[PDB]
Amino acid sequence: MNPPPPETSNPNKPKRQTNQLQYLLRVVLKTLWKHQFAWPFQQPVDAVKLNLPDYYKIIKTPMDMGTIKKRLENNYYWNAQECIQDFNTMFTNCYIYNKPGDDIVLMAEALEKLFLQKINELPTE
Template sequence: MQELMRMFSTIFRQITQHKWAWPFLEPVDVKGLELLDYYEVIEKPMDFGTIKSKMEAKDGTGYKNVREIYADVRLVFKNAMKYNDEKNQYHVMAKSLLEKFEEKWLLLLPKVAEEEKRLQEEEAEANSDMQRAREATYANMARELSSELLEVDKDLKNLKEMVIQKCSCRKLTSEEKRILGTALAKLSPENISRALQIVAENNPNFQATAREVDLDIDAQSDYTLWRLKVFVKDALEVNEKTTADTAFNNNDITEDKKNGSKRKRDSCDAQAKTNTKRTKKVSIL
């Protein structure tokens, strides 16, 4: 680009040093020449002095490429030709210099096009590199976030296990086991399968995936029972079965409620068998 600017500067100097270039070296003296309608005809005044100053600017206000300079040089001549009629000397001088300028520009144009293509390729490559860098950054952030979430899940699981371990120091009463069995019978087929998996995790001999499964509540360890209690409570809350959830967590049940719970248990056992009919038969003992 610097080489192109240097070559264009040579063309610019040749044009501005031409004997007919003097009317265009400075801004049009609109007031002195009493050109009252000049700004009505010419939308954007331009002159060689303004172009030269902009070419030499070091404060970032200068031209970014030779096409911008080319456009302003043409504008100088086009303005003169537009404001003055064809027989006017300024129109003739501007038209003649414009033709000479276009001839020189055509010789430079292939190099301009080549440089522009190179810059476009560089910009495309830079954008591609930037995009890859952004994607790599986002991928790293996603991995870090995923790791953090896994750690959080792990910590929550450990905390839950700790709570269960502490709770399991106390054995479930017969009434609590009965209520647990009733609550298990109210689970959906999907949650029944998940509950059986909990049992299998602490009892390798338990066939959780068998077609027919007998789940003996009394045969399970205290740890397994507490895990089942927590799971069933969460599952019933999700299903908005608040009545069963309240009964499941209430250890101070009256005698009337006990009798009512027994009737509900019989009903729920029948319902559980109906719900699991399509998948497996689960008998809660």
């Protein structure tokens, strides 16, 4: 059985808009979402649909780009680092659950390399 997805909104959290958060949504998330390998990462891992009955026994901090998109859009993140950490969690979850050399690991590695290229150009101020 799948867990509920990660929280994406909280009416009590303070909100702010920074140039880095705007770039994370309008550039970073947008670019990764369109990538040829993005589709397995566009929504929470559905262990029932995918027949992965051990997924949530191994992965205790699930994360995905659909969740990250919602967090950015809802102003859930206060610090750009929170969003960067969620992307890192997504990539590392793939490396944890799978094994070196698996196709899905190669795909995650390619998305991670593109992610690092884009966050290298995070704006200042």
